[PDB]
Design a protein around this motif. Sequence first.
Motif, PDB file in Angstrom:
ATOM      1  N   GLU A   1     -22.070  56.334 -41.093  1.00  0.00           N
ATOM      2  CA  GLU A   1     -20.627  56.546 -41.073  1.00  0.00           C
ATOM      3  C   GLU A   1     -20.387  57.304 -39.774  1.00  0.00           C
ATOM      4  N   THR A   2     -20.766  56.578 -38.728  1.00  0.00           N
ATOM      5  CA  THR A   2     -20.739  57.047 -37.342  1.00  0.00           C
ATOM      6  C   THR A   2     -20.926  55.716 -36.585  1.00  0.00           C
ATOM      7  N   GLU A   3     -21.504  55.724 -35.389  1.00  0.00           N
ATOM      8  CA  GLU A   3     -21.598  54.437 -34.713  1.00  0.00           C
ATOM      9  C   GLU A   3     -22.964  53.778 -34.780  1.00  0.00           C
ATOM     10  N   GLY A   4     -23.883  54.237 -35.631  1.00  0.00           N
ATOM     11  CA  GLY A   4     -25.227  53.675 -35.682  1.00  0.00           C
ATOM     12  C   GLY A   4     -26.075  54.146 -34.514  1.00  0.00           C
ATOM     13  N   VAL A   5     -26.976  53.316 -33.978  1.00  0.00           N
ATOM     14  CA  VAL A   5     -27.720  53.833 -32.773  1.00  0.00           C
ATOM     15  C   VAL A   5     -26.870  53.909 -31.518  1.00  0.00           C
TER      16      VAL A   5
ATOM     17  N   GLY B   1     -25.601  33.731 -47.349  1.00  0.00           N
ATOM     18  CA  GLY B   1     -24.594  34.761 -47.570  1.00  0.00           C
ATOM     19  C   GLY B   1     -24.794  35.944 -46.634  1.00  0.00           C
ATOM     20  N   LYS B   2     -25.965  36.036 -46.010  1.00  0.00           N
ATOM     21  CA  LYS B   2     -26.282  37.091 -45.095  1.00  0.00           C
ATOM     22  C   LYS B   2     -26.282  36.707 -43.630  1.00  0.00           C
ATOM     23  N   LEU B   3     -26.106  35.446 -43.291  1.00  0.00           N
ATOM     24  CA  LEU B   3     -26.132  35.039 -41.874  1.00  0.00           C
ATOM     25  C   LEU B   3     -25.060  35.727 -41.046  1.00  0.00           C
ATOM     26  N   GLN B   4     -23.822  35.899 -41.615  1.00  0.00           N
ATOM     27  CA  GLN B   4     -22.815  36.574 -40.860  1.00  0.00           C
ATOM     28  C   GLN B   4     -23.153  38.013 -40.618  1.00  0.00           C
ATOM     29  N   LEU B   5     -23.891  38.656 -41.516  1.00  0.00           N
ATOM     30  CA  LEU B   5     -24.325  40.033 -41.387  1.00  0.00           C
ATOM     31  C   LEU B   5     -25.321  40.107 -40.223  1.00  0.00           C
ATOM     32  N   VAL B   6     -26.198  39.141 -39.997  1.00  0.00           N
ATOM     33  CA  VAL B   6     -27.133  39.208 -38.872  1.00  0.00           C
ATOM     34  C   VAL B   6     -26.348  39.120 -37.575  1.00  0.00           C
ATOM     35  N   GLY B   7     -25.484  38.128 -37.553  1.00  0.00           N
ATOM     36  CA  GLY B   7     -24.532  37.827 -36.474  1.00  0.00           C
ATOM     37  C   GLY B   7     -23.608  38.991 -36.153  1.00  0.00           C
ATOM     38  N   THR B   8     -23.078  39.741 -37.070  1.00  0.00           N
ATOM     39  CA  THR B   8     -22.216  40.904 -36.754  1.00  0.00           C
ATOM     40  C   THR B   8     -23.121  41.966 -36.206  1.00  0.00           C
ATOM     41  N   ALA B   9     -24.321  42.232 -36.709  1.00  0.00           N
ATOM     42  CA  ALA B   9     -25.097  43.357 -36.164  1.00  0.00           C
ATOM     43  C   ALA B   9     -25.552  42.961 -34.744  1.00  0.00           C
ATOM     44  N   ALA B  10     -25.812  41.681 -34.544  1.00  0.00           N
ATOM     45  CA  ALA B  10     -26.186  41.264 -33.219  1.00  0.00           C
ATOM     46  C   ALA B  10     -25.068  41.383 -32.207  1.00  0.00           C
ATOM     47  N   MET B  11     -23.813  41.090 -32.576  1.00  0.00           N
ATOM     48  CA  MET B  11     -22.678  41.231 -31.703  1.00  0.00           C
ATOM     49  C   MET B  11     -22.461  42.708 -31.411  1.00  0.00           C
ATOM     50  N   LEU B  12     -22.674  43.528 -32.462  1.00  0.00           N
ATOM     51  CA  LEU B  12     -22.541  44.991 -32.173  1.00  0.00           C
ATOM     52  C   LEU B  12     -23.569  45.487 -31.183  1.00  0.00           C
TER      53      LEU B  12
ATOM     54  N   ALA C   1     -25.280  43.705 -29.019  1.00  0.00           N
ATOM     55  CA  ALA C   1     -24.994  43.213 -27.660  1.00  0.00           C
ATOM     56  C   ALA C   1     -23.833  43.978 -27.108  1.00  0.00           C
ATOM     57  N   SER C   2     -22.788  44.322 -27.901  1.00  0.00           N
ATOM     58  CA  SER C   2     -21.689  45.103 -27.317  1.00  0.00           C
ATOM     59  C   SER C   2     -22.158  46.471 -26.774  1.00  0.00           C
ATOM     60  N   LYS C   3     -22.942  47.205 -27.554  1.00  0.00           N
ATOM     61  CA  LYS C   3     -23.543  48.447 -27.108  1.00  0.00           C
ATOM     62  C   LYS C   3     -24.433  48.252 -25.869  1.00  0.00           C
ATOM     63  N   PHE C   4     -25.172  47.119 -25.700  1.00  0.00           N
ATOM     64  CA  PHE C   4     -25.991  47.107 -24.507  1.00  0.00           C
ATOM     65  C   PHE C   4     -25.079  46.814 -23.295  1.00  0.00           C
ATOM     66  N   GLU C   5     -24.146  45.881 -23.445  1.00  0.00           N
ATOM     67  CA  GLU C   5     -23.443  45.370 -22.265  1.00  0.00           C
ATOM     68  C   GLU C   5     -22.056  45.833 -21.979  1.00  0.00           C
ATOM     69  N   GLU C   6     -21.289  46.296 -22.971  1.00  0.00           N
ATOM     70  CA  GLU C   6     -19.851  46.523 -22.651  1.00  0.00           C
ATOM     71  C   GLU C   6     -19.641  47.960 -22.201  1.00  0.00           C
ATOM     72  N   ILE C   7     -18.642  48.201 -21.399  1.00  0.00           N
ATOM     73  CA  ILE C   7     -18.233  49.537 -21.027  1.00  0.00           C
ATOM     74  C   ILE C   7     -17.643  50.236 -22.242  1.00  0.00           C
ATOM     75  N   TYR C   8     -16.786  49.562 -23.037  1.00  0.00           N
ATOM     76  CA  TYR C   8     -16.274  50.061 -24.290  1.00  0.00           C
ATOM     77  C   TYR C   8     -16.474  49.070 -25.454  1.00  0.00           C
ATOM     78  N   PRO C   9     -17.610  49.231 -26.120  1.00  0.00           N
ATOM     79  CA  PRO C   9     -17.882  48.364 -27.281  1.00  0.00           C
ATOM     80  C   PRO C   9     -16.957  48.659 -28.423  1.00  0.00           C
ATOM     81  N   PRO C  10     -16.604  47.703 -29.237  1.00  0.00           N
ATOM     82  CA  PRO C  10     -15.781  47.945 -30.410  1.00  0.00           C
ATOM     83  C   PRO C  10     -16.505  48.918 -31.303  1.00  0.00           C
ATOM     84  N   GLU C  11     -15.759  49.631 -32.129  1.00  0.00           N
ATOM     85  CA  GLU C  11     -16.415  50.547 -33.072  1.00  0.00           C
ATOM     86  C   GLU C  11     -16.921  49.759 -34.289  1.00  0.00           C
ATOM     87  N   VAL C  12     -17.820  50.399 -35.062  1.00  0.00           N
ATOM     88  CA  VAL C  12     -18.407  49.746 -36.195  1.00  0.00           C
ATOM     89  C   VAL C  12     -17.400  49.328 -37.260  1.00  0.00           C
TER      90      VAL C  12
END
Lengths: 297, 297, 7, 7, 258, 258
Positions: B41-45, F77-88, F90-101
């Motif tokens: 309940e924060t931003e994760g890693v 039922g879990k494929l979208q969950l893999v896909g959302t964590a992967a988009m997150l 990738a956002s954290k590695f590459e974006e200047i301002y990644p969306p929040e969780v």
Amino acid sequence: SMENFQKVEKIGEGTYGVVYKARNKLTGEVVALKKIRLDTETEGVPSTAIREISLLKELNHPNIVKLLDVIHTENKLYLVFEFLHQDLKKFMDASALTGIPLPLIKSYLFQLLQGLAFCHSHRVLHRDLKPQNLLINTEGAIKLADFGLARAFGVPVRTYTHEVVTLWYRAPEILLGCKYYSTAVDIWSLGCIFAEMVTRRALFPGDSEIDQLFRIFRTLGTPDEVVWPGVTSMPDYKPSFPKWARQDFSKVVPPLDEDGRSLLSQMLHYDPNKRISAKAALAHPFFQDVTKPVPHL
Amino acid sequence: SMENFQKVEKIGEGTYGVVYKARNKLTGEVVALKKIRLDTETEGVPSTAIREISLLKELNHPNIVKLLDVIHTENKLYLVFEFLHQDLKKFMDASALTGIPLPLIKSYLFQLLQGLAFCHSHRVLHRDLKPQNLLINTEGAIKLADFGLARAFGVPVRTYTHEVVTLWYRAPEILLGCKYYSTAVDIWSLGCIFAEMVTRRALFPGDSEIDQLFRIFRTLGTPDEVVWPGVTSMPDYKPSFPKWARQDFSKVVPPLDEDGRSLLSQMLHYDPNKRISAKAALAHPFFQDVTKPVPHL
Amino acid sequence: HHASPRK
Amino acid sequence: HHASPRK
Amino acid sequence: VPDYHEDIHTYLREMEVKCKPKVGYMKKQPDITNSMRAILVDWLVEVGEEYKLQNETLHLAVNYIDRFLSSMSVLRGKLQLVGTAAMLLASKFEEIYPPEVAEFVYITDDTYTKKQVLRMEHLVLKVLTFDLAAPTVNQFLTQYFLHQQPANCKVESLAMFLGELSLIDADPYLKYLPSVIAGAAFHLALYTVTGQSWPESLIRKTGYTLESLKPCLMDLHQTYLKAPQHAQQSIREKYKNSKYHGVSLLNPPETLNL
Amino acid sequence: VPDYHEDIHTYLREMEVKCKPKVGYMKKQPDITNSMRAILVDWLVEVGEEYKLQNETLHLAVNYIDRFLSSMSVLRGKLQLVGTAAMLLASKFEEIYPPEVAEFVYITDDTYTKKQVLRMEHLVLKVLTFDLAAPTVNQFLTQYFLHQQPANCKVESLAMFLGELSLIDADPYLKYLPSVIAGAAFHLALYTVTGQSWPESLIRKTGYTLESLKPCLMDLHQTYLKAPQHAQQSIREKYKNSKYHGVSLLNPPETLNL
Ligand SMILES: Nc1ncnc2c1ncn2[C@@H]1O[C@H](COP(=O)(O)OP(=O)(O)OP(=O)(O)O)[C@@H](O)[C@H]1O
Ligand SMILES: Nc1ncnc2c1ncn2[C@@H]1O[C@H](COP(=O)(O)OP(=O)(O)OP(=O)(O)O)[C@@H](O)[C@H]1O
Ligand SMILES: [Mg+2]
Ligand SMILES: [Mg+2]
């Protein structure tokens, strides 16, 4: 570390803990968790677990259960496997009225021979083949499993542990105490399982080691120096053993055709040097028409 | 988990936790443990940790600290590194009376350039080069560390984060707000550090961005269209900036020889497209006699 | 001295 | 039936 | 029973390249040297004799020591701890009756507790990722021994003695693969006892000529000639026994005529 | 600033071969198909558009999904969950301002909780061993773009639109490395807009000829001709914009004259 698994049900129990059917809470994957209890002020990781894990990591084949992960904690050791519908003994028990269909018995044996010939080609002796240690899935596959008695062997072999193989599937060279045994003991276990799938009952259900040997001698004939040179000098051989004559396989495995009887007798040859290898068995004419039927589950 | 490490002392502190000197209880290895606090309940890693760890995994070089392990628990994340005697800032502070011997200054810069040129060749911008982020050992090595601001860059680059590099070591194309920056910003930082090793004090100790720019302008001359084409159209450029004349490096870095002056001015060239690269800097005549002295610790 | 700039 | 032999 | 022989040989040739230690690792150990590793392996040779463990167990324990030290810097006071946990794991993989942990603690004289041995066991398993089934000089020797015309006891003991000597000295022997040290050892043993040479059937089976073995054989010849003066002597002591035909007493050839 | 360019190019050529998904993985997924993957990637195309994320972030997220599915069986039922964590990630590695969780959780419409997303993020990082700096089609296109005589905006947008189309269809595009898809895409775009071909300077720089590119080009030409009828349409929608010179409205060449 087991935070992502939800235990669903007891599937079996054993030696160092138990086996559960579980699911990966994040991906949905269904797995089999084999718990090995450790402790401390004990012997550390059990040699059977050290062998099972390291031989499994070198056995990547469609007919060998896949080891998915190893969760090696401070308190416990978990082996995480792919989950398969059930073991061959439970399938056999559920099929005792019908019997397993002929094409599916041939497909199961061909597959077990391909898993076994890969193990032997990677210098691994399984040493505990029996129906409860073999797993089947809903699509027609069968896989070797329970590598808890396995061992990497060398060329030529040295002497190995004498107490190997569950009694009913145990080869006569072990029962007679031979100094050396090798890959032919797994072939013996497979011919016994082959017969069992056919007749719906254990081929040699001994209740002790001498009884196990006499059940084998009453079916195949008490071996002598002509069928197996060196037999009468084996450590536990006794010249007072009853001399029974060989029984005709039409009485031994009635439902089996000529090709299947030829294959079975080469898997049950007394002389381990002459017993058929898994690889030569894959070329027998019993498999020319092999298919992959789906079990009725 | 962290079972096997024994915390010995606090080595530094940062953003996400603390930095400890620790030892592996089983092997005796001395390590630096960098704790990154997570939660839930924060931003994760933290994206800075995701970059630090993945960039470090691709930067295997004698002049780049070595990441030994990553202990990724459910509550905390620990970066496990090789431990080096101290950072260059602490070594500098301890040498303010003596000064760092000339040969060791040249050795330190040559090694900093070799680790930086390896970074750039692996498409990684460091973006936080300062003395406290550089690590020295007792035998004469110096290494890049603190990859907490780094980033994998693309050919040609796109726009990246504007708030990068600790103020005193920040390039003028960042201070002027250029849409694009690239590898030349790390070179600028290293030019600053080379001077600081020479004179024993920060070359451009600003106390705010306009002050930082003005310190640079007073030493190197206020840039104009001849020295840096495009300068006067930069977003934070102001035509009312005082126009100071360039100072002779004999006043700027008095102890430095002709070859060292030549190299320093190519590292501090205003125009990023003309600033020297780390790889060409490795071939300057200032390094023809380079050796590897051991620091006096 | 200043701290390293912070995401 | 018998158990698997035990080390 | 040759049915699987060739498959097995091919697969060991492939696993020895994957289970191989990194050659220059010692150069990156800040506190231990080849001489400390030498004393370590010599001591395991004795531990082996005391407990009647297989030569193969010894050879596996050494491969696990060099693989672990290949990625883990270790202080000199802990090197024996790495070596005891590795001899414990090799025993558990290979022996019918491995010594108990309390015995491994006694042979170190209480230099470590039981709990240190058990924890170093779990660290060695993780560093090696449980890949314990490595190919050893011993596994290739035994294969090479089936091509002897006719079988010679003495040659076999002597090839074993030489393959074991190579375990002591990481410099030069970490340069060579198990299958190559075994070839050099079998050729040297054969040459020494009967005057014959690396056989034509082994040349075709391994693809190694006497020329490809030469660099390893020159080193092994120097180690054989200098064995009586080496600082470590447990292997020479062990091969004095009648179990080994006393081969360490034979005199090494003066020249190999290569 | 070309100083490091060739080194980087070589290094990317090497990391793409190591970051590459295993080609027939879908065949081993018991519950998910290329079609469900196609629906998933089309959805991340839209998520990208909604949050204004880089094209590079999208291509990373795809690379992480195919590497994760390469060793992990996932129920539908879990494929979208893999896909959302992967988009997150990738956002954290590459974006200047990644969306929040919490935004990633909202775009899934509360199909998963925040805690599921955060735990799947930790499992993806472990399955990928944190190796997130992967080479993408986009990284190679942008370097290829420097060899255009002179720069053409339309060729660039179209080479991008094609490289993005490739991400949707695991079959046939998992057969081709990033650098090869990029080369096929840059040739097709160029050919379509100006009639020119894969340039001689790229031939020397990548070693790729129009002949080695042919298999990928034939596939990408059939994907471009059939784009208006594919079930997934977010990439054509996105490339209608003026930011992209409306290139997804251009008509594909009828033949390549190969
Ligand atoms: N991957 C699996 N999928 C489904 N069931 C499985 C799986 N693994 C094991 N089982 C069940 O668990 C039982 C016990 O497992 P395993 O044979 O591996 O351990 P064991 O208890 O040590 O067996 P044994 O007592 O014969 O040595 C197997 O007979 C089978 O019935
Ligand atoms: N491997 C190491 N060996 C010795 N000291 C080290 C090591 N790593 C870090 N340190 C010390 O800890 C200090 C803090 O480390 P690090 O720079 O990596 O993280 P940080 O706190 O995020 O730094 P900063 O605040 O500049 O962002 C370093 O300046 C150095 O003094
Ligand atoms: Mg079992
Ligand atoms: Mg720092």
